[PDB]
């Protein structure tokens, strides 16, 4: 309890480095123990986003992101239930040149964690942690849920690509640590997105005339997002990331629009 | 000749054919290389589902053309 709040502060010192593994692994340990005051923990991290240093604020967001990905699901569930999550729409650290540069990136990253939280609330599971493959969640979803679900994947994606950082702006250990977590979410979210699309394209040719309209707009959007995902993956390539970890987007079903349009034409 | 078949999961198949081979025969050869029962194979080219009795030449499928395979429910 007193130890939690103190490890939160250790994760979020003014040291210009990402949160330390020892403090992040302890916090993960916390979330999983039986009598955790999850609200109190979350509360301590929000409190550190009220701070005026960009270093503190951005490391508190990174820790929260880290804990949504690796912490007990109970942590992401609480964040998604809250009324207000991160209120950093006006954040600005005028202290120096780094503060000025890193304040736009704090505003964007805070927006992305809020969307991640809303995404979880709207479908009640984490797109980046559900069973993959031909019997996974997104491949086997039934038609109604699929059509309501794939748009929520797309809105999370869009908020991730809005961080919109160039490789030559990843100039300190804080923003890089955020970047690497954004990268991890992106490839897992794209995997969930490509899988929903596969399913959609399979079902499309037995769908009703007005489900093909919903599905056709989902797909058109999938194609525009893929051009922007490839730009983000080029930043990843530039920074030096293992190229076997970058998805090959040429494998996505990206050339079927014509088939989907002629088939909607025939349905009229 | 050589044609390609791209599945929705991303694999690209290479198949040996002749322009006269029926779409039904082309599906049977996809059975032989990938295991997919022909009755679950939608083949698509130039935006149209390809009919079993028509031939590759009836659809303008020549060398190095890529067909799309979409799996279907019986």
Residue numbers in the entry:
A (entry chain A): 19 to 286
B (entry chain B): 1 to 74
The authors write:
We obtained a crystal structure of the CALM ANTH domain in a complex with Ub that we verified with NMR and mutagenesis experiments. Structural studies revealed that Ub binds with µM affinity to a unique C-terminal region within the ANTH domain not found in ENTH domains. Mapping the chemical shift perturbations from HSQC experiments with 15N-Ub bound to the CALM ANTH domain onto the ANTH:Ub crystal structure showed that the residues undergoing the largest changes were located at the interface captured in the crystal structure. Although wildtype CALM-ANTH caused significant chemical shift perturbations within the 15N HSQC spectra, no perturbations were observed when F223 was altered to Ser or Ala alone or in combination with altering D224R or D276A. These results were confirmed in GST-pulldown experiments using GST fused to five tandem copies of linear Ub that bound the wildtype CALM ANTH domain but not a mutant ANTH domain carrying the F223A single substitution or the combined F223S and D224R double substitutions. In this structure, the v-SNARE helix sits in the same region as the C-terminal helix of CALM (residues 261–276). This proposed binding mode for v-SNAREs substantially overlaps with that for Ub.
Attachment of ubiquitin (Ub) to cell surface proteins serves as a signal for internalization via clathrin-mediated endocytosis (CME). Here, we show that additional components of the endocytic machinery including CALM, HIP1R, and Sla2 bind Ub via their N-terminal ANTH domain, a domain belonging to the superfamily of ENTH and VHS domains. ANTH domains are part of the larger family of ENTH (Epsin N-Terminal Homology) and VHS (Vps27, HRS, STAM) domains that are found in the N-terminus of proteins that play a variety of roles in endocytosis and many bind Ub (Moshkanbaryans et al., 2014; Takatori and Tomita, 2019). ANTH domains are structurally similar to ENTH domains but are larger, with an additional 3 C-terminal α-helices.
